[PDB]
RNA sequence: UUCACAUCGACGGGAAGGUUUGGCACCUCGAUGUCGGCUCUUCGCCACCUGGGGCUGUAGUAUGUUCCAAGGGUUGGGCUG
RNA sequence: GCUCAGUGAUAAAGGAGGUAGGGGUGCAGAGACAGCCAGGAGGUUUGCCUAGAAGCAGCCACCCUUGAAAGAGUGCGUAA
């Protein structure tokens, strides 16, 4: 849910110059990207798979083992997935910048905070 | 333990439990000893 | 194993099974009853093992009735056979039965063991069944 | 279990059984065989009547035939004897006796009741000194 | 809400010391200190008259499953603080027997080497040489596991009931060679 | 504690008796003859017998009732029982006989009248086939 | 298997 | 031996697979061609061995059957298109 | 309103204290289910069979009595 929100502002949807040919988006620096949450079983069921290429060259992670090995691929491998393909769209994962502490080096860029006005996106316990 | 699709009680002692999505059969004796599947 | 003993024609047309049996529906010989559930084709073997069945674990227990009979023919032809140059070989017999048709009907037990030997009859079945009293 | 019916006619027999008998007394059993539930069914019939009852069953039929200062005999495991014709003492002597050979069988005495009035587990000793109808005739 | 087991309510018996801290719940009495943690719906109340009543924040067939549980727990934390937990179990063969040493049990099983066993702080192991062993703790969990880990190196065999038993156990003796 | 099966008037043979309760501690002449004495004060019939045994290997034992199946049919006058009990009936006895049977029974039973231990009799005689009236 | 697929407009 | 369910499981039923023998004729006809070996792989698991187990009509050794498991292994000859 | 299976992509007989509902039928306030305490007897070791069969290898019968209740016995067990 918060993936969705990230790849709209990255994208540029929400603004009223829009262009699907043009990167009008913002960047969005992603912070504690180990305490991201997962509904139900996904933490043990959800599978990372990722192939060589050679033939019996698949290896597959549990969404824990990649989260205790290298936080940052989980957030990167979702947004990714939701931005568009093609030249535009790698030039604009670019614009996803994505750390596991809470604390960033961009201060200097001043960040906004991220408006989410999706009800379901923040989860309690 | 004997594994298969048909799984009752088969005697009085027995009780069909439910373990982790899989229904077993526990019983005093070990024979009576069955899973599902 | 049950079989007419003559007809005219061997083969015969594979038909349709279509509706409800409304005339075999009562059970008017015995007291308890297997009834049919779904429409289908039993072959005289299927019923020859259920009866048997029922006959084996009633035992103690008096009668068992066959509401039905195999009457109707059925045709193949051989393996390594190209389609054509005639209809093939009556190997067995049909009885066609509809759902709510009565098949098995018993007399002569408790319904304890009634309902054991019943379900062990319909085992041996291609279909789907239902256990029923008589009103 | 027991219908309505069968214990209204229960605490009716035991209320009849109690209109006719002078005396009542409290055993409690818990843990003891049958063997000698049928001899002192062998002592007991002859001279005098005994019934096992439930606590609201004794309840209900005591308190309308007048015994109901007994009531608080009534708290666990329940026994009952009424005498019909043989006199108290020769009714209430074998009780203790067999309590005695009963130590180690788990019998206890909660109290007898006479003239009315509620006697304890130890008041009972002069209930068992009182003689025959021969003696006090 | 209807559980026969949340409805009774625990005792705090003298010496033992409660602090509640929203819903963790550490407890210090006789022989030590015990803590917990309570999920989302489990609201246990500690009275005026000294005793704990749970109840439930919801019932979903959650809550209801997760109280029964916890009133058990915590009735176990309390009793385990208080008195303490004593698993005993015995060794029955030629040639079986245990020695506590210092931060070991050593058990001479039949195997080849001898087992050590390092036993747990919250964990005294009491040995009698005459093939017994009685392990006592505040925790049931802990003292329960360790007993278990000791079963597990030779678990009852059927025939002549060789091996590490509890002290109560119907083991099924088939007779060999008839 | 030990149950034994036993003729009237005679014992101590090897065989049946004497090693199984003798190894047991049980004094042998003194429960034969004791035990035929008993027998010999009832009337003499063949007696199931429980001899109770204690560690200082003194006895007592409680003589129980002679079967009401032999003694039922000496009082058809018949041998052997029915095969199939009240399907083919082997024999006739009297009420009397009834209430003679359920008299030397009498003090082996728990019945606490004549009426219950004579329909006891009838109900061991109609389960062996023997017909009563 | 007894049973066939969907090949084409059937599908 | 007792005991349906250690192991077999008759009379019948319900399936999966797509490796056998087939049915079809959608496919290519111009030079889109079948079975064995050599060399060289690779994959599946319905597991022959090797790792861990449950049950046994498992005393022990060795089995039997079954569960998870496809990482590795799976000889050299006489004989055949 | 439902689902907790990532079901939500496909297949059956069969299995099931999964779960949310609906409908009949048992009992109970002289206390129903579960647990716990006790009792579970007499004929009789039923007859037959058998070296033995005593509730409990097998066959037939399966009544009666004392009773709050207790089957000529549901399973284990003994050569019995
Ligand atoms: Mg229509
Ligand atoms: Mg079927
Ligand atoms: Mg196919
Ligand atoms: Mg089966
Ligand atoms: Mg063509
Ligand atoms: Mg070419
Ligand atoms: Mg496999
Ligand atoms: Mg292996
Ligand atoms: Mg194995
Ligand atoms: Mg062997
Ligand atoms: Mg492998
Ligand atoms: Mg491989
Ligand atoms: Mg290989
Ligand atoms: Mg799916
Ligand atoms: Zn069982």
Same mark, same amino acid.
């Given at each position: ?125 | ?6 799984? &009752? ?8 439990? &439910? ?15 069955? &899973?599902?599947? | ?14 038909? /349709? ?5 409304? /005339?075999?529906? =009562?059970?008017?010989?015995? /007291? ?23 006959? /084996? ?19 193949? =032809?051989?393996?390594?056979? =190209? ?17 709510? =048709? ?34 | 279990?027991?219908?309505?019916? #069968? ?5 009716? !027999? ?7 008998? +002078? ?5 409690? +059993? #818990?843990?003891?065989?049958? @063997? ?5 069914? @062998? ?21 309308? !035939? ?28 074998? +009780? ?6 009963? #130590? ?14 509620? +006697? ?18 | ?178 | ?60 034992? %409680? ?31 009297? %009420? ?24 006891? %009799? ?12 | ?11």
């Amino acid at each position: 849910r918060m993936a969705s929100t990230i790849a709209i502002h990255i994208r540029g949807k929400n603004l009223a110059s829009y262009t699907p040919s043009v990167d009008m988006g913002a960047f969005v620096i992603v912070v504690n990207a180990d305490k991201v949450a997962v509904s139900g079983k996904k933490r043990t069921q959800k599978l990372y798979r990722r192939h060589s290429g050679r033939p019996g060259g698949l290896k597959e992670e549990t969404f824990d083992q990649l989260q205790k090995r290298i936080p940052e691929r989980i957030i990167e491998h979702a947004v990714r997935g939701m931005l568009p393909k093609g030249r535009l769209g790698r030039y604009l994962f670019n614009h996803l910048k994505v750390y596991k502490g809470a604390e960033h080096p961009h201060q200097a860029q001043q960040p906004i905070d991220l408006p989410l006005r999706d009800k379901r996106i923040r989860v309690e316990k | 333990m004997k594994i298969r699709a048909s799984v &009752r009680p088969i005697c009085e002692k027995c009780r069909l439990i &439910r373990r982790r999505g899989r229904i077993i059969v526990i019983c005093s004796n070990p024979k009576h000893k069955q &899973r599902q599947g | 194993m049950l079989s007419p003993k003559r007809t005219r024609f061997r083969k015969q047309h594979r038909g /349709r099974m279509k509706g409800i049996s409304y /005339r075999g529906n =009562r059970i008017c010989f015995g /007291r308890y009853a297997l009834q049919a559930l779904e429409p289908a084709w039993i072959t005289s073997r299927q019923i020859e093992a259920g009866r048997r069945a029922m006959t /084996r674990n009633a035992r103690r227990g008096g009668k068992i009735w066959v509401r039905i009979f195999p009457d109707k023919p059925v045709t193949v =032809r051989p393996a390594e056979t =190209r389609m054509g140059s005639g209809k093939g070989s009556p190997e067995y017999w049909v009885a066609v039965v509809k759902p709510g =048709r009565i098949l098995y009907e018993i007399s002569g037990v408790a319904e304890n063991i009634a309902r054991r030997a019943v379900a062990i009859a319909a085992s041996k079945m291609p279909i789907r069944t239902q256990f029923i009293i008589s009103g | 279990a027991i219908s309505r019916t #069968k214990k209204e006619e229960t605490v009716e !027999t035991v209320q009849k059984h109690l209109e006719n008998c +002078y005396l009542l007394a409290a055993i409690n +059993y #818990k843990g003891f065989t049958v @063997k000698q539930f049928q001899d002192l069914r @062998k002592a007991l019939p002859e001279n005098t009547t005994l019934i096992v009852a439930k606590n609201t069953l004794v309840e209900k039929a005591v308190q309308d !035939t007048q015994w109901a200062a007994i009531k608080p005999c009534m708290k666990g495991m329940n026994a009952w004897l009424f005498v019909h014709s043989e006199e108290i003492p020769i009714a209430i002597k074998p +009780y203790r006796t067999f309590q005695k050979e009963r #130590k180690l069988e788990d019998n206890d005495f909660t109290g007898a009741c006479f003239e009315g009035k509620f +006697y304890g587990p130890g008041e009972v000793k002069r209930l068992e000194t009182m003689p025959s109808k021969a003696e006090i005739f | 809400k209807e559980s026969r087991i949340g409805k009774q309510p625990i005792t705090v018996p003298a010496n033992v010391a409660i602090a509640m801290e929203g819903q963790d719940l550490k407890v210090k009495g006789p022989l030590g200190e015990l803590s917990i943690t309570y999920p989302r719906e489990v609201l246990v109340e500690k009275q005026e008259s000294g005793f704990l009543r749970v109840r439930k924040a919801v019932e979903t067939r959650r809550a209801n499953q997760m109280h029964g549980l916890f009133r058990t727990l915590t009735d176990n934390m309390v009793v385990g603080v208080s008195k303490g937990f004593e698993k005993k179990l015995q060794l029955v063969g030629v040639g079986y027997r245990a020695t506590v040493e210092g931060k070991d049990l050593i058990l001479s099983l039949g195997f080849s080497h001898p087992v050590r066993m390092a036993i747990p702080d919250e964990l005294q192991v009491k040995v009698e040489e005459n093939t017994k062993v009685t392990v006592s703790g505040r925790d049931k969990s802990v003292v329960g596991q360790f007993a278990a880990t000791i079963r597990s190196w030779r678990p009852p065999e059927p025939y002549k009931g060789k091996g590490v038993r509890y002290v109560d156990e119907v083991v099924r003796r088939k007779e060999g060679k008839a | 504690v030990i149950k034994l099966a036993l003729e009237a008037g005679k014992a101590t043979p090897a065989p049946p008796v004497g090693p199984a309760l003798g190894s047991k501690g049980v004094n042998i002449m003194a429960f034969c003859k004791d035990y035929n004495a008993r027998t010999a004060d009832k009337p003499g019939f063949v007696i199931p017998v429980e001899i109770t045994v204690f560690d200082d290997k003194s006895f007592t034992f %409680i003589l129980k009732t002679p079967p009401a199946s032999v003694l039922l049919l000496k009082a058809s006058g018949a041998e052997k029982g029915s095969k199939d009990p009240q399907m083919e009936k082997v024999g006739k006895i009297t %009420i009397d006989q009834l209430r003679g049977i359920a008299t030397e029974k009498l003090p082996d039973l728990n019945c606490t009248t004549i009426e219950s231990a004579m329909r006891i %009799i009838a109900g061991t005689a109609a389960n062996m086939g023997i017909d009563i009236d | 298997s007894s049973r066939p697929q969907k090949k084409g407009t059937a599908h």
